[PDB]
Amino acid sequence: HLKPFPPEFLWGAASAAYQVEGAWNEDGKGLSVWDVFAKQPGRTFKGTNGDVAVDHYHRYQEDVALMAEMGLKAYRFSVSWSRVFPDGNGAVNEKGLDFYDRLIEELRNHGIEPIVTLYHWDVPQALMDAYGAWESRRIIDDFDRYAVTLFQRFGDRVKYWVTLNEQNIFISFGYRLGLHPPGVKDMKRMYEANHIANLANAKVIQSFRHYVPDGKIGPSFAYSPMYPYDSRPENVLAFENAEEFQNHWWMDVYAWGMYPQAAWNYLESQGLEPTVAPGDWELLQAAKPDFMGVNYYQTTTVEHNPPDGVGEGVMNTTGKKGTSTSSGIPGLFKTVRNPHVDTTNWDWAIDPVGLRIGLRRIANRYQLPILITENGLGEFDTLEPGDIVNDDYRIDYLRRHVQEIQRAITDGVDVLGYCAWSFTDLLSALNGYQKRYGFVYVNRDDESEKDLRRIKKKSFYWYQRVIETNGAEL
Amino acid sequence: HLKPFPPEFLWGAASAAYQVEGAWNEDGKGLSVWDVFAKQPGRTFKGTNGDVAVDHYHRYQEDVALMAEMGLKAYRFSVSWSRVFPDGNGAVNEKGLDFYDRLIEELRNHGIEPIVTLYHWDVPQALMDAYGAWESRRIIDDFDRYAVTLFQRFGDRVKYWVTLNEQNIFISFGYRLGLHPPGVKDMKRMYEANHIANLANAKVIQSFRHYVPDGKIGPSFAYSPMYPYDSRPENVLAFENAEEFQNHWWMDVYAWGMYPQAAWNYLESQGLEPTVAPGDWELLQAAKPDFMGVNYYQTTTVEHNPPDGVGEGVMNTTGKKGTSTSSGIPGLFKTVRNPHVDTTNWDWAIDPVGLRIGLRRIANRYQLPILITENGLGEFDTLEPGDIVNDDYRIDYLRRHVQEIQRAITDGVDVLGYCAWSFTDLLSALNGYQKRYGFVYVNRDDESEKDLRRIKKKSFYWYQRVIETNGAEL
């Protein structure tokens, strides 16, 4: 006897500003770090970038009309900081705020709840130039000024807010793997920038309690739950290390204001632990979120990794299956193909039960409500003549994950909503346009913008029926 | 680089009153539930009982002398409730208090730290007769009065106190499996008596803060960390359920004062959740321990168990390897032999890495210091000519486990000490005398009581050398 989805369950879809808006230099918008980075040769798939993306900036009315047709209860989007402060921390660009005001008014006029993401990796380039952006404590008050600007302008109309989207990704990709701006490969700098982002997160949550006393706020963590390969004790210990280093390192700080101790000591032993200032722990412990935001796509299985073992592996950014290779931390753990699940063409594991496990782990460890801020299937789509897209593979993926959400709710996890990535097709920062996630196909590819026309996929009508039945009919 | 064991690490050994003392009816001692239960035919191995045990009650001076020869830093023993209150409540028996006074003086006069366990399974039969012992809230104030009596008489000389030893064992065995007093097979009653035991533990810890303000106290949990069989999502989920149901169910209450929510929901859905009265949560959440006590012998590997699957299985009280079979809870998990570790003749997993994992899990989840109150190998010993007991198998087990403790300490776990089970051979209620745990052989078996003379085993001299080098030489 499964519990039903609660009556006000937030059935949503999501996007991010750099990935969907376009209009990169219009109406006073400044450069973001992604404007600059993506135009460096070799940084993005086929040199794709967000100059135009899918032009949501100009076409938001058509897109919101499609959301209304679907019956979306919630739409999660991010605000482009460089539209609001073109130089990051100077005078406000009113035309920038006005875009998001028009967007929010469009959502509310169709009965859709806005979910505002403050930060989706696009800090203005001017802050990188002035002081290195997230690597400097100066960003704490600059991010707070920006957050409070949005809180005051939109807090009367927006109840649900996300602070940092996938801090573990934009920090580790920007400072350990060098795949995001600023392109650094330095573990000491990574953990320093990470600590500053933790403090910025806490500061803005503190501010939120003053400026939006009846709102709900949380970070959105890129959560891949770890599995041991088998019951060999060394592999279970590898799993303990992996879960703590990859997941508790972030979520313990979000929930408890404390880093986990075994991980801290391993970094201390390598001279990698971040610099801690007086007041840091007090701020991190005082900023309790209303929920843990969860971006979930796949689990990760790990096994023992000797001290001279595997480090950085090969990442699949082309969609040729089976091209990724194991990665890990020497002495702690390394990843291994999970033989009991299938994978996508980008080698992401398809593990709906892993979402139930992840939701249970967060509830069991932190007792926090969860907002699923991202989940979806990135795959090639074929436009068939007559403007038909039969993405049964995407329906099957979403269906099985939504079913496991219902089992977690029945277990006692307080799930507040589910936001599918993505509403329309959009730019994947590192994979181009052909790794599509949308309910709505956009007619363009990596070589041509074509006409950017919106075409409803079969998954569009499937999710429409999920929402109409409140998830009773999947 | 391994860290050294800290300078004041408590190198110890342990026993339990009913298993070691004898003198079951001397100096006004009342009958305990074990006095009565072990005399019923078929309850214990070959009808062995603790009428004489190894007669430590009359030979404690000899046993403490052997401790001083070995160089024990600490000795963990339990106090017999029926020696102190033959009735459970009512008049204190001064000759009962006087025995533990003489014991504690003997330990202190040889520079050995006493660790007093308040309760090891032997509630006076009178309380079982009057109101069902642990199934009644009356036991909360009666246990408290007993504990406070011990705090007042010995608080000045005893710093380390253990409240309930293996609450999960004497509750589950006594009310689910029917193998311990009172021999019940009723899960509803088990969870009621468990809840009262939780309240009793909390009340005594609160009293402890008043009466022994400079002491350290905690429960000692029988911890078998759970492993998933493999990375099949359904088997990881079985591991989440097993770890929560078998371990978090107790340790979450000890550390946070809360039951885990999914396990609670499962029990409530079966009409098995305990009765909560006003003020239960407040008391349980106020009673933070100074440490988590850990009795570790083995890990458990689990796998998926369908709704129509395995329940209770066969236990090995014989010593014939391969007799035990799988057990579990239908729909949640069932146990499976771990193909990657060896096992004893009683089918217990030999998994020293499992101890490090369990220590890491407790530190990672609760951030508590750990006192390892029990660890040992139960095996057959042969007395060879020349008073030689070559228990190399026992040395091998202990050495590997101590080595993993050192790695846990190096990882950052705060391990306060290590109490091997047991100092002398003693009585196993369900396994008899031939499953020996001691550093010191005791001359008796299940048939012949002989003279009970003490003989130092090879492992006695090994551990003497461990303590002498503070663990540098294993």
Ligand SMILES: O=P(O)(O)OC[C@H]1O[C@@H](O)[C@H](O)[C@@H](O)[C@H]1O
């Ligand atoms: O585009 P990707 O890398 O395939 O992932 C799909 C999406 O989910 C997460 O990674 C991010 O929050 C988004 O920026 C987007 O990347």
